[PDB]
Amino acid sequence: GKTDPELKQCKHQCKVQRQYDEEQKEQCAKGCEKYYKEKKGREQEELE
Numbered sequence: 871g872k873t874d875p876e877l878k879q880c881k882h883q884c885k886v887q888r889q890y891d892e893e894q895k896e897q898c899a900k901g902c903e904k905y906y907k908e909k910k911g912r913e914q915e916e917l918e
Contacts, residue, residue, distance in 0.1 A: 877902040 880902030884890040890898055905911055 875902070875907050877907045880906075 877899065881895070881899035884895040884898035
C-alpha cells in the first residue's frame, strides 16, 4: 500500500547533474515535490 512519486527523480537528476546548481536543486525538488507530491497536476498552470 504505497505510491511512488516522481519527486525522487526530479531531485535525483538535480542531485547527480553538475549543470543544476545548489539553489537550482532546491527549486528543482520544490517543483516535483509541490506539483506531484503537494498538489495535483489537474491544472496546466497555477493561478497567480
